[PDB]
Design a protein around this ligand. Structure first.
Ligand SMILES: CCCCCCCCCCCO[C@@H]1O[C@H](CO)[C@@H](O[C@H]2O[C@H](CO)[C@@H](O)[C@H](O)[C@H]2O)[C@H](O)[C@H]1O
Lengths: 431, 57
């Protein structure tokens, strides 16, 4: 009714839904693709993909289980999904996979069939998924020589250099209990799981903490992947944003909300009450964009992302947009702010209140790791609404106005201008 | 130029067009002050003022 949180060594967390047809259990390791290193990159995405190799996934397929997995930057998750009654059928199959079995998934016929498929995997991504590719490199340059930089799915380089002796090197350090959280989502009780958990003995590497690295940092920089053979142009730009559990966590998400997200095709999109939109549409400066305030444990990235078949006029594209961003400091309409608060809520909803347990897991697992607990929607909303204009005019005033940016891109970006232009559009001339 | 002594006045923004013109206005008196002094001194004894001094009629 307010989400449960109790620890007997294994911090056991759950979240009940009485109208759910199914449920899900799993673990979340409080160390992700940003706890790795330059040459072991993709180790966390390698771990995910053995966990779903036909072997272990045929086991749980007779049982009636489905497994879910994802790696982030600050965190890393291993979830299993099934019918709510077969709730022990989950917990046991989890127990087998992470304390019982070890080299049953770590075969020299398994691992050389997973790594020979996480290699094709990260060779369609950087090959044909430019919007994320661009998005990923954006981190690489903004957070260069620092934790967040390492692409979550790992470089094809440090991904052909890795054997099983390396899957473990990360496992036995960062796959602990004092870095994990067990989650219960969907259609199960707190007294169903934490019972079935204290039912099982053993302890893996107790007392052990996972290790640390130099805290992340940010620096104004570019990286440009020109490719004049690609029909469009993809660009992503940002400033040093705000972390998870930062005073302006919501203030910053409200700002993103204002300019928001465009799709020049859906007539619905064309009518949004966004000021910037007035400009961009005249000549069709782009095909779409969208904003964001990506928050991570140590640092953040407020900016936006755009694709465009309009090559001669990208220079305006970036211009109109970064000028709008100036208003946030000097001239944002209050009535804009309300449409923000309003729309944030709708978005922040379909995020948190989707009828899909697997999401409510990672969400829970990550948050109850970093701050300890989760924060309720009513808590969030109570904050969103407190937000004045002055909220947004002092946040932009430090974060946005005349601060270093972080551009990245690919496709026909000859037209995308230089760094002393772009960066300079962070401000406006004053008397 | 020291990051403290600058940022005090101007925090993290440049000079502003009008503050410039203000400084300009001030500088222009402060300068023509100094330089006209240093020059009248450097040429002491030589100036008609210094020569008006001794010479009587
Ligand atoms: C031909 C005769 C020419 C006569 C002499 C000309 C003198 C020009 C003086 C102009 C000063 O103009 C000044 O420029 C600075 C940039 O340095 C501007 O600063 C602006 O961009 C900077 C970044 O560069 C931001 O820090 C700042 O928030 C913004 O206001 C400022 O708005 C303006 O006040």
């Amino acid at each position: 009714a307010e989400v449960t949180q109790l620890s007997n060594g294994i911090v056991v967390a759950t979240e009940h839904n009485p109208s759910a047809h199914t449920a899900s259990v799993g673990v979340v390791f409080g160390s992700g693709a940003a706890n790795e290193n330059p040459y072991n990159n993709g180790v966390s995405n390698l771990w995910k993909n053995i966990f779903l190799s036909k072997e272990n996934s045929a086991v749980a397929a007779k049982e009636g289980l489905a497994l879910s997995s994802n790696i982030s930057r600050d965190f890393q998750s291993y979830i299993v999904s099934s019918l709510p009654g077969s709730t022990d059928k989950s917990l046991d199959f989890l127990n087998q996979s992470f304390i019982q079995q070890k080299a049953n998934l770590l075969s020299s016929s398994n691992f050389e069939a997973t790594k020979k498929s996480v290699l094709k995997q990260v060779q369609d991504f950087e090959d044909n998924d430019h919007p994320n590719r661009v998005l990923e490199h954006l981190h690489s340059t903004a957070f260069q020589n620092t934790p967040l930089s390492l692409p979550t799915r790992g470089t094809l380089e440090s991904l052909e250099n890795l054997v099983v002796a390396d899957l473990e090197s990360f496992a036995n350090n960062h796959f602990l209990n004092s870095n994990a959280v067990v989650v219960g989502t969907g259609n199960i009780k707190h007294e169903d799981l934490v019972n079935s958990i204290e039912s099982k003995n053993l302890s893996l590497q107790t007392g052990t903490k996972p290790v640390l690295k130099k805290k992340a940092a940010f620096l104004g920089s570019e990286v440009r992947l020109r490719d004049d053979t690609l029909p469009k142009a993809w660009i992503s730009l940002a400033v040093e944003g705000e972390p998870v559990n930062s005073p302006n966590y919501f203030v910053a998400k409200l700002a993103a909300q204002i300019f928001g997200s465009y799709n020049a095709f859906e007539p619905a999109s064309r009518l949004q009450g966004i000021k910037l939109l007035d400009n961009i549409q005249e000549y069709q400066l782009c095909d779409n964009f969208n904003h964001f305030s990506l928050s991570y444990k140590d640092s953040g990235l407020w900016g936006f992302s755009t694709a465009t078949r309009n090559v001669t006029m990208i220079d305006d594209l970036i211009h109109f947009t970064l000028k709008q961003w100036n208003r946030l400091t000097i001239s944002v309409t209050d009535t804009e702010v309300e449409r923000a608060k309003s729309l944030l809520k709708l978005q922040l909803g379909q995020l948190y209140e989707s009828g899909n347990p697997v999401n409510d897991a990672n969400l829970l697992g990550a948050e109850v790791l970093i701050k300890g607990s989760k924060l309720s929607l009513g808590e969030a909303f109570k904050k969103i609404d407190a937000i004045t204009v002055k909220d947004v005019k002092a946040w932009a005033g430090k974060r946005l106005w005349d601060q270093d940016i972080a551009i990245a891109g690919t496709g026909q970006i000859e037209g995308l201008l230089d760094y002393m232009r772009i960066r300079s559009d962070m401000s406006m001339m004053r008397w | 130029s020291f990051s403290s002594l600058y940022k005090t006045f101007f925090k993290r923004n440049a000079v502003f067009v009008g503050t410039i013109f203000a400084g300009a206005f001030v500088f222009q008196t402060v300068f023509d002050t100094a330089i006209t002094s240093w020059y009248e001194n450097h040429n002491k004894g030589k100036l008609w003022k210094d020569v008006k001094a001794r010479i009587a009629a």
